[PDB]
Enzyme design. Sequence first.
Site, mmCIF file in Angstrom:
data_model
loop_
_atom_site.group_PDB
_atom_site.id
_atom_site.type_symbol
_atom_site.label_atom_id
_atom_site.label_comp_id
_atom_site.label_asym_id
_atom_site.label_seq_id
_atom_site.Cartn_x
_atom_site.Cartn_y
_atom_site.Cartn_z
ATOM 1 N N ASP A 1 -10.018 -1.909 1.538
ATOM 2 C CA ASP A 1 -9.802 -1.049 0.303
ATOM 3 C C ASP A 1 -11.003 -1.499 -0.529
ATOM 4 O OD1 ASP A 1 -7.553 -0.008 0.998
ATOM 5 O OD2 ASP A 1 -6.489 -0.502 -0.896
ATOM 6 N N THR B 1 -3.575 6.041 -3.328
ATOM 7 C CA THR B 1 -2.489 6.876 -2.696
ATOM 8 C C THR B 1 -1.280 6.730 -3.272
ATOM 9 O OG1 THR B 1 -1.987 5.206 -1.134
ATOM 10 C CG2 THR B 1 -3.902 6.680 -0.486
ATOM 11 N N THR B 2 -0.867 5.847 -4.303
ATOM 12 C CA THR B 2 0.333 5.706 -5.071
ATOM 13 C C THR B 2 0.195 6.655 -6.510
ATOM 14 O OG1 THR B 2 0.708 3.642 -4.297
ATOM 15 C CG2 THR B 2 1.916 4.245 -6.336
ATOM 16 N N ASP C 1 1.044 -1.190 -0.009
ATOM 17 C CA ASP C 1 -0.090 0.006 0.000
ATOM 18 C C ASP C 1 0.855 1.331 0.136
ATOM 19 O OD1 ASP C 1 -1.558 2.259 1.141
ATOM 20 O OD2 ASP C 1 -3.191 0.790 1.080
HETATM 21 N N1 ADP Z 1 -6.013 -6.005 -14.689
HETATM 22 C C1 ADP Z 1 -5.290 -4.575 -14.792
HETATM 23 N N2 ADP Z 1 -4.909 -4.483 -15.898
HETATM 24 C C2 ADP Z 1 -4.703 -3.147 -16.100
HETATM 25 N N3 ADP Z 1 -4.559 -2.438 -15.370
HETATM 26 C C3 ADP Z 1 -5.033 -2.434 -14.026
HETATM 27 C C4 ADP Z 1 -5.407 -3.764 -13.650
HETATM 28 N N4 ADP Z 1 -5.676 -3.840 -12.349
HETATM 29 C C5 ADP Z 1 -5.601 -2.406 -12.015
HETATM 30 N N5 ADP Z 1 -4.915 -1.875 -12.871
HETATM 31 C C6 ADP Z 1 -4.596 -0.309 -12.536
HETATM 32 O O1 ADP Z 1 -3.861 -0.121 -11.338
HETATM 33 C C7 ADP Z 1 -4.065 1.104 -10.999
HETATM 34 C C8 ADP Z 1 -3.931 1.032 -9.531
HETATM 35 O O2 ADP Z 1 -3.113 0.443 -8.937
HETATM 36 P P1 ADP Z 1 -2.965 0.168 -7.369
HETATM 37 O O3 ADP Z 1 -1.521 -0.675 -7.079
HETATM 38 O O4 ADP Z 1 -4.157 -0.159 -6.804
HETATM 39 O O5 ADP Z 1 -2.504 1.627 -6.850
HETATM 40 P P2 ADP Z 1 -3.513 2.614 -6.326
HETATM 41 O O6 ADP Z 1 -4.833 2.041 -6.608
HETATM 42 O O7 ADP Z 1 -3.559 2.952 -4.942
HETATM 43 O O8 ADP Z 1 -3.187 4.039 -7.301
HETATM 44 C C9 ADP Z 1 -5.413 1.626 -11.611
HETATM 45 O O9 ADP Z 1 -4.913 2.757 -12.335
HETATM 46 C C10 ADP Z 1 -5.824 0.328 -12.635
HETATM 47 O O10 ADP Z 1 -5.977 1.117 -14.095
HETATM 48 MG MG MG Z 2 -5.922 0.395 -5.509
#
Ligand code: ADP
Ligand code: MG
Lengths: 154, 351, 523, 528, 50, 56, 278
Positions: free
Chosen positions: D391, D90-91, D57
């Site tokens: 989450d 948050t990233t 996270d």
């Molecule tokens: N199966 C997937 N294929 C492509 N992109 C994905 C997939 N799952 C999640 N994402 C992308 O990952 C991003 C979020 O990453 P995450 O590690 O959850 O960090 P955060 O949500 O805190 O920014 C989103 O912008 C989403 O578009």
């Molecule tokens: Mg997320």
Amino acid sequence: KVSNSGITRVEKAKIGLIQFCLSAPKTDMDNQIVVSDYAQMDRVLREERAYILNLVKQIKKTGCNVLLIQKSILRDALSDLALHFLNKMKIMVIKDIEREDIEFICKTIGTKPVAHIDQFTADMLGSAELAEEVNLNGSGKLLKITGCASPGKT
Amino acid sequence: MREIVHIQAGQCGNQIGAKFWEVISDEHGIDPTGTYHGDSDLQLDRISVYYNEATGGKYVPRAILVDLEPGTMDSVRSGPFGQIFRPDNFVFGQSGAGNNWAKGHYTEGAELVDSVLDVVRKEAESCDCLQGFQLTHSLGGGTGSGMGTLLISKIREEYPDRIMNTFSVVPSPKVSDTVVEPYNATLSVHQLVENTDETYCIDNEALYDICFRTLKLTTPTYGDLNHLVSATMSGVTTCLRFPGQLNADLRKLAVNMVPFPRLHFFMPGFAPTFIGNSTAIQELFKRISEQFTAMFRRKAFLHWYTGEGMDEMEFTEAESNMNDLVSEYQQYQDATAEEEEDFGEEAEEEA
Amino acid sequence: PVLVLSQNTKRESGRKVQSGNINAAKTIADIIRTCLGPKSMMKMLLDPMGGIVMTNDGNAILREIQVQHPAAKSMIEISRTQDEEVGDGTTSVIILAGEMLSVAEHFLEQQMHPTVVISAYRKALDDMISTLKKISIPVDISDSDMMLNIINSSITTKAISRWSSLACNIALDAVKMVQFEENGRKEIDIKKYARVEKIPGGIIEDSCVLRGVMINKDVTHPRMRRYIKNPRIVLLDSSLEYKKGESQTDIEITREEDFTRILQMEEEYIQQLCEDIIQLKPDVVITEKGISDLAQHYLMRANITAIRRVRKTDNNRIARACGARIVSRPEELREDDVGTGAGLLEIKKIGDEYFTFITDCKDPKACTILLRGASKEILSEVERNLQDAMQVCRNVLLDPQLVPGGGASEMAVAHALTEKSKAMTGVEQWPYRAVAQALEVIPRTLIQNCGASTIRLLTSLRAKHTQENCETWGVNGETGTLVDMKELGIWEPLAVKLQTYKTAVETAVLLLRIDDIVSGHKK
Amino acid sequence: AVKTLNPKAEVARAQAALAVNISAARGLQDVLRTNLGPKGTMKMLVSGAGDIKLTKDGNVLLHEMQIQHPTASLIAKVATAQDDITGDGTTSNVLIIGELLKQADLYISEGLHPRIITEGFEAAKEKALQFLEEVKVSREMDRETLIDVARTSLRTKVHAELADVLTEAVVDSILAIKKQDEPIDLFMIEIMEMKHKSETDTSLIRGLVLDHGARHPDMKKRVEDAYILTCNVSLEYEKTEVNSGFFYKSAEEREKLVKAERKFIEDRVKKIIELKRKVCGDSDKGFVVINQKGIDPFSLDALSKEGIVALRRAKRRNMERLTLACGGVALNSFDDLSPDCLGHAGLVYEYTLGEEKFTFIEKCNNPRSVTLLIKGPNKHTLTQIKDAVRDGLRAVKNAIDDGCVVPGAGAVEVAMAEALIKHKPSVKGRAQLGVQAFADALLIIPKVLAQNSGFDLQETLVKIQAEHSESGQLVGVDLNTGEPMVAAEVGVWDNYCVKKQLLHSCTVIATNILLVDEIMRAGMSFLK
Amino acid sequence: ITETKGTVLIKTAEELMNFSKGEENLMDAQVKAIADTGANVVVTGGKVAD
Amino acid sequence: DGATILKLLEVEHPAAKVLCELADLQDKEVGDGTTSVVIIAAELLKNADELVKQKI
Amino acid sequence: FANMVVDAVLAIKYTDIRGQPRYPVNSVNILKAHGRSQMESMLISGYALNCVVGSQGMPKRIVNAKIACLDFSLQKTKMKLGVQVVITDPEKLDQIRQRESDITKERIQKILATGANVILTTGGIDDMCLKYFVEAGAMAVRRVLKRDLKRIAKASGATILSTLANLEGEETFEAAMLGQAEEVVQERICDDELILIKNTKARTSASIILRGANDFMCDEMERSLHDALCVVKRVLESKSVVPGGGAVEAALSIYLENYATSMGSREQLAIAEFARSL
Ligand SMILES: Nc1ncnc2c1ncn2[C@@H]1O[C@H](COP(=O)(O)OP(=O)(O)O)[C@@H](O)[C@H]1O
Ligand SMILES: [Mg+2]
Ligand SMILES: Nc1ncnc2c1ncn2[C@@H]1O[C@H](COP(=O)(O)OP(=O)(O)O)[C@@H](O)[C@H]1O
Ligand SMILES: Nc1ncnc2c1ncn2[C@@H]1O[C@H](COP(=O)(O)OP(=O)(O)O)[C@@H](O)[C@H]1O
Ligand SMILES: [Mg+2]
Ligand SMILES: [Mg+2]
């Protein structure tokens, strides 16, 4: 200084010296008042007021204008109620007289010390022509008693 | 039987508690591993009041350790007699209050008091019938005073009619370690008055002037001051922990010692224990208020508190009630009334 | 041994003291002069507790600095007095004091006694005041557009200008909701009834002013209603529980039935207390002290909603908003002390936390301001800006006069003093002109922050003000040209200018009279 | 200037403050960029005491790295504020802040004042918000769409096998505690954790789990059909508020007073027993007492002699939850005890785990409160699963609260960039440069994703931009082939409020940072 | 004994003489009543009085 | 103000504490001229010592 | 400032035995508040208190003011050290606890029955007792300094009371021990508040409010004003003045240098040195 708020001049003063306390009653033996009903709470205050007022009226009956109270360090020698009553009767009050200059005072103004209210009679009083507090310019205040009818050798 | 739980907050509170528990454990025969090797069973007649017995024979203290900074728990765990405590009773944050009352009472405390209240619930669930709480903290800090006061208020809300005792250190007369010490002390006394049954005020300089002159040899750090405080607390609590010719819990001492509820501040002593309602307390508060006004008239350092949510009139109410407390203490002597302000003007006419 | 007379006191005297004082004042003025005008840049500062202050306000900069030289302490103090008196103009006063103190050493180094300079400055201050009052313009306070214009002109310098049309409105409404007349004819715009609550998150455009109040509390018991349409509210200053007296009370029992009997009477007490409330048939009970569980039982049986441990300030604001008054003994509760001016009570969750809103009041004399934003620092700066705006609004409501901004007033006063000074003779003629030419540091600084040629713009403006009716010409602080303030629309209250000039001149007068310093004298 | 007044002060003037800020922001993003996407790597954090935390996270990583910087504190506070409201994103926040600052510096280092770039930022933000207002997709929010959203939000914290287990529990709980109005209220979902039985046994219970049991050895361990009484009245020995004492004469009076001092509690116990006898006449049903206050051994004995299970000192919030699940009334007094106040439960039983006891209440009629039971073999496993559950719940709640959902995988960022590139000719001045900067920053989200999957940033980005230019479909990255894909059809969904909040916060903080003239530390070193 | 503080308060001599005998008689009655049920061994978890 | 300056300073030579108390007395008795009295006393002392150095 | 000082001094002249008038300076209060220029310092014909109203529910302006000065605290009564409560019948407990809250109430009504509007107290006032003043529409100020109360009572004609007891057993409050003031206001000055009592009827009184740039300046002005007040008092008491600038020193030096010739001894040198030192 005088504890009385307002009186600073006495002409043809009658002075008495006191060695007892004008406060609430207190036996030399351990005492306590027990209350178990709501009327006693009012009664205690009423009886306290009457007790103080009786002493003050006895003092006034003799014609005293200036009162000297000797120091006491175990019980209060002059409470606010007694001071208020004495002010209402136009009596000038001076407290905290040291225990070692009583002989000098008695020799000077002719007083006789009184340690009991029953003995506070008009013949234990001294007579002076003027009793008043003076204010030096900045150094403080002072109290002068002048014109004693029966002057001692001081 | 009539269990008591003990709560330590802040660096000073943790330091004092770590020695309080050490000097208690050696009396009852407990070991740093939790086992028992005592001889006389007189030690076990009232063992359950302070220790909870687990399956297997171990005894664990009924203690909760709290602070907003993880520095002190690492020392406590790594120090002596620091492995008998329950590992789940350590509660800590990540930032710290930085000697700010408002941050401890409003911002950082509010997000952590829930954990303390969820731990005290589980510690109370294991006792047949609790009787009260013990608290150790400081009045000159942020976590010790503001957060401690908020915790006191919350405990009083959750547990209505259980006794509460505090062991608070107080600011020293001629030396103040922190610039904002009067503010914290004045704002904590306000809510110490109405939420505790008794307070045991302890001064740092007064007890600090015993090791040099009486102990004949010291150039010490907080160290032996802490051990002396722990010894005083053990001498206070021997009545609870042990049976004697006349045993009496702290309530049975307070009822004989506290006639009037709001005048419940004490000054200890030690002769190898003495506890007295000496009215020399009225001298301490008279000093603190004297500082408080001197700063509040200049609005110094005020913006550090206002930005956290407090209002300007809270200080006014706190100082008003401090003056009320000082006057209530003064009305019991009738001899200090002789020292009224000397009259300076010359108007002494007819009436 | 060591024969001494004063125990290591350090003494300094002579011209070196005067030079040091003037240098310290100018050094204080140098830290700030980059934060004047609509092109100012921010500064971030670190406080002893680990926080961060990203700000643009002069007082917020100066009060975070530790210093040793007493002249700097005097300058900081005059900054905070300016902040407390009027709430705006804490940057221009420092620069003006620095300039007026700087233009004095030229005469001090030419064997002229300080008292002459003091007399000249005091003579010039009166003419400054008269000329300021001469070019004033009245304003009608019933025109909302003009008031919005004044507030906007006050906040085009700060960081919330990007949402000016929002913030302006907010400020105006708040003031209009707190103006209040009571017994007698005493009118007040007290600002302790306009509370600012900050909640991080959301977006700034969601900030608003509530017709009511907002508290961080929740219902005491879950079954209490969280939504009441037209509530009747009673406010208590006491605790609904059994407590001890103070008259040294003890009980001695010998009979079996007494103990339980005593334990019953306490409960009976609570019951009658609750009844004394239920007789008024309310819907919400607010108290500053605790509430016992038995009281909650009785109130819930009577269909009431209760809140605990609200602060005294919040209780006062609720009393002023809904129309109730605080009561400490339920036995003396009347119908006149029940507040019926509210229009809704709601309890919401805002990000894992419960909040209580009392809204839709008929005519509240207290309000609350709800701000949302990115983080704590941004909301703190927005709070400071809102304070500035509301203080300006109050000043204009208490004194409806206006003077041109952008440097028009400074050049007009300087020209008036220059024209008046040629009717005098003596040495005092030369200091008297100096202060006049010390008033030109305000436009100049503006130009320097815009990035323009001060040497040509200043002389063009001086030539322009020489004409007969050009008292409103000034510098456009965003482009770098000369423009009439009638068309641009930058106007400021007269009180701020009067306070600025008075404080600057008096600080200069105070600092010109020092002649020596003694230090380390043990109180 | 301030040095002549405070010799111990620390200062950073015009060109140095900007360098400090940019350097620190880039330093933060260089570490936080390895978390984005389901292909991110896992971090291990060890504190001074020696405890271990495995995490991915952004917020946890920010708050558990050893850093002392001012602007790092600013960014951490912004991330915390975003987390406390939305719970996800948050990233990307930190990444976008860092890239925005880097792009701005690229132009500032050539002699351009930051106010121009600030104005460009504002205009670009308005245009991007307008575009996002029309990309969104509105639906009915059926169970399947919520399944997709929850799974998308959960695969970025745990592996696939555990995510397929957590998704069903999260969606089912949120749907179970929902009414057709009265927006969703969390705190009606209790998270309890037990340390055994490897984590593929995490489950959802349509009842309650309480972390304490019966304190009398003679109480029944299993009850098949139970009435539930919920109260907070005290059954402990209580004393008079005013001071009091006993004064007796001999032994017999002492005994009389001893038995006399217990009636105030014996009356309450008798009231409970009378009600139980009245309702549960024959010994076929059950009776369970859940109390928020203490209970003596005497009261426990008296209750257990009749066949009552009693629990003492339940948590305060349960006072509501049980009432919503079992369906009774939580009462403070016994002077009106009646059979309407009682709830019903179809199974009550106890489970002992080592030194601890748990109580299960199950088979309620229509429970409006449920429990998520976490299981696993370690402690860091349970902590990580708890964060993932938070989450997922926040994601589903935000999906329901809005009427719309946004396609993900970076499609919306590419669309916004392409729309912003054609808008910059309209604006006048050098502000166009600022607009350009904004567009480039919005491309930091796709790039990193590709770079986390083992592809090359530039050629993959060019392939993505090749589509959405001839076929206006919203296309994003496919993290196992590198080819463009239609995000909506595959099932990758993102929340709308998250994106809106992220844009607002990033723009505001970057704009406020870019206008800082000088850094000052001139106050008191410590508050002592 | 009572949980709340209790004191034996006497006002005459006869009570002072009779108190100890009363306590002893009560204790004997309690022990004999326990013994009459047939119990041979008593196990306790607290103090035993003399 | 002469009295305030002389009161705020720390002095330990008796011959200067005498003058400090002189300034305080002048302030109490009258309230003005607390600076001139110190000058007068110092000059008188100096001129008298000049004579006492001669066998006067 | 000279006009202000002369007016303030003349406003305090007291009427003694009439052998000589007296002017008790320092009975004129001086208050400091930074803010506007020093030319905005004000003279108040009345009195100024650095105090604020007890509660925010009270009125803050009274037109025709009846003033009662008190020297005791209005708090719920407690029995003294000697007295204690011992209860053997529970039924008698409740009536006791009411009495503590009733006694003080019975006092307040006695004060409010005579039409008093403003009550000043040197002791504290409980929050339970502030409600009576709030309902009755009256101003109550607590923690007033003793000397300020003395000056106010002397100026307005009121009487200071340390207790309500009379020359009989009971407690009474009469209407003849009330002062009268023509206006009482709570004014706001530079972010703080204070109280004005204007146009007292028994005697004239004065006060001064000093405005300045900061605290150092205001303190210096107060110290300066004290000197002028004392000088004017001395001039009024003793009807003689003397020139300044050094005329006296020069005249005395010349005269003493001339007079030293007649001694003709070793005292001549000392007299000459005295003259030269002047
Ligand atoms: N199966 C997937 N294929 C492509 N992109 C994905 C997939 N799952 C999640 N994402 C992308 O990952 C991003 C979020 O990453 P995450 O590690 O959850 O960090 P955060 O949500 O805190 O920014 C989103 O912008 C989403 O578009
Ligand atoms: Mg997320
Ligand atoms: N648009 C503008 N053009 C020119 N001058 C302006 C403009 N807006 C404000 N000003 C000037 O800026 C000055 C205000 O300075 P500011 O930086 O707000 O701090 P302070 O108000 O504390 O001096 C005012 O004198 C005003 O004349
Ligand atoms: N206008 C004036 N012209 C000439 N001499 C003056 C004037 N005003 C005051 N003085 C002189 O100043 C002296 C008083 O100085 P001052 O600073 O007041 O100290 P102090 O009076 O305490 O000694 C007096 O001797 C007086 O002669
Ligand atoms: Mg401004
Ligand atoms: Mg003089």
